[PDB]
Amino acid sequence: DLGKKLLEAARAGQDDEVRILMANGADVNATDASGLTPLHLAATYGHLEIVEVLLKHGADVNAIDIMGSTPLHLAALIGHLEIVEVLLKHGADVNAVDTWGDTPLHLAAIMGHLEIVEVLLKHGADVNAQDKFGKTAFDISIDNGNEDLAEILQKLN
């Protein structure tokens, strides 16, 4: 199966094998056993060109794996700024909620990705979105003592 092969290529960042595999009819929206698609994999592992190509050819920007993780969750978690911007440009849901009640804003804030937090806020990240323990990205910034993050999270108006 070419679906399995495309998942491996996008993960490893093999741009050429991604092109070749798709050309032979590989499902651009194939899923592994946990529901990750080539797009979740390229977005996690920072392959910008692969993300752009998948999106240009039918990849569902808001596909969820078994845990509710969208490609945006993963790019916000890992700190890939250009990928976050490309996903948002392609209609990524800024406020997608996974199984832990996390949104991309929670993940960028936990990981200290400040530029991504600012980008997400400008695209309408919900500042009041609570995780399974009732925490917002702001509650995280204040319980952590992260003043720089607290400042950006309050700047709204």
Partner: protein, 431 residues
């Protein structure tokens, strides 16, 4: 309780270790050639604790320099006190650990470990009365974290009756090289909780905030961060290096500071906090030193002391001052903030005064706290570790080095359990 064997592992470990050797050599009047040139017998009274006496009245650090990366030796050797180190004490690999704990702990590190242990053995056999081991390393990388902790478990099994002490640098995204730093640090804390007696938590989050927010350094460098580290390292070892009554050795310090075996992570504090090349226009008074060393802004771990309670405190005052005024300020801090010091550990704050001030300061104070508020540093790392672990990001980088996924679950359980243990004693009452 004479000799301490010093080990420095990885890039950070060898950077902060080098700085420690430069600072203490200047304090003891030892030049880069290993010759004594000072003007006080107090400098040499306890010189044997960190230095071996070589032939021709030379003093040589009891230091072992370790790394998997090659260019680390070159960088240390080119340094001001580079030539003071014993050449045979340099154990350096050529492959590197690629910021991976598993590479440091199981692969590249396991290939270099026995040759490090032979040098550790040569140094230990020549000791009249070995106190134990002091290791400098970071927790966020591969060598210092993975190989450093591998060395710690191997040294503990060979020397079970010696104290194991660490200066452990905690990662921060404000400083950071990678997203895998919460993995490397959590994996190392699981080792530290079990195999060290005393750990000084040197937090990069705290160092960066001091440099940026207090010292107004717009773009803090490693050299700016290390200026704070070297002040702390000098301060926390004053009692081991100069004549005194209090915490004069590693085991007396541990018996005073550690009420519960796992709760051995210390919050270091220092006053005054300065930038490199900053002119001192006045010396701080005893009341100012007391207030500042207990101030959250002066802590080397990004934790607020008011959010927890002190189990035990060691306070060191340096310079010429009144022992009566020190006594009074120390009594006042405790009595005015009494709810912040556990009532079930009476007289848990111990004070030492050392006549010799550090370089450039007429007066200084170092704080060593065992506070339940340190659970905030462990909560920060655990939260980032859990954020990454839930999504299984980069796990193959670790399991590909042999490592089982179960070791991540175990390290996560351990850190959460430590946080719960601090919380328990923070809510404990003498009813």
């Amino acid at each position: 309780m004479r000799e301490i064997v010093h080990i420095q592992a990885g890039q950070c470990g060898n950077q902060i270790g080098a700085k420690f050797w430069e600072v203490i050599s200047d304090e003891h009047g030892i030049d880069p050639t290993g010759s004594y040139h000072g003007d006080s017998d107090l400098q040499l009274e306890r010189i044997n604790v960190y230095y071996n006496e070589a032939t021709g009245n030379k003093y040589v650090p009891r230091a072992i320099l370790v790394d998997l990366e090659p260019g680390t030796m070159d960088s240390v050797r080119s340094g001001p006190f580079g030539q003071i180190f014993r050449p045979d004490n340099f154990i350096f690999g050529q492959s590197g650990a690629g910021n991976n704990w598993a590479k440091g702990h199981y692969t590249e590190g396991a290939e270099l470990v026995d040759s490090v242990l032979d040098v550790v053995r040569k140094e230990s056999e020549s000791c009249d009365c070995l106190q134990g081991f002091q290791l400098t390393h970071s927790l966020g990388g591969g060598t210092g974290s993975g190989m450093g902790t591998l060395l710690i478990s191997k040294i503990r099994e060979e020397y079970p009756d010696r104290i194991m002490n660490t200066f452990s640098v905690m990662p921060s995204p404000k400083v950071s090289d990678t997203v895998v730093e919460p993995y490397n640090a959590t994996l190392s804390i699981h080792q530290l909780v079990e195999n060290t007696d005393e750990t000084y938590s040197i937090d990069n989050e705290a160092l960066y905030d001091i440099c940026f927010r207090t010292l107004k350094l717009t773009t803090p460098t490693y050299g700016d961060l290390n200026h704070l580290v070297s002040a702390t390292m000098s301060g926390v070892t004053t009692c081991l290096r100069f004549p005194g009554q209090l915490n004069a050795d590693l085991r007396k310090l541990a018996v005073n500071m550690v009420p519960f075996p796992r709760l051995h992570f210390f919050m270091p504090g220092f006053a005054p906090l300065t930038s490199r090349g900053s002119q001192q226009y006045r010396a701080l008074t005893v009341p100012e030193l007391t207030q500042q060393m207990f101030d959250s802004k002066n802590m080397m771990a990004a934790c607020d002391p008011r959010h927890g309670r002190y189990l035990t405190v060691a306070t060191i005052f340096r310079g010429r001052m009144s022992m009566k005024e020190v006594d009074e300020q120390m009594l006042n801090i405790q009595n005015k903030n009494s709810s912040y010091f556990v009532e079930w550990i009476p007289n848990n704050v111990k004070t030492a005064v050392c006549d010799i001030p550090p370089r450039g300061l007429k007066m200084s104070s170092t704080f060593i706290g065992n506070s339940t508020a340190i659970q905030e540093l462990f909560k920060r790392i655990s939260e980032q570790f859990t954020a990454m672990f839930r999504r299984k990001a980069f796990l193959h980088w670790y399991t590909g080095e042999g490592m089982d996924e179960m070791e991540f679950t175990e390290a996560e359980s351990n850190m959460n359990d430590l946080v719960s243990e601090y919380q328990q004693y923070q809510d404990a009452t003498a009813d």
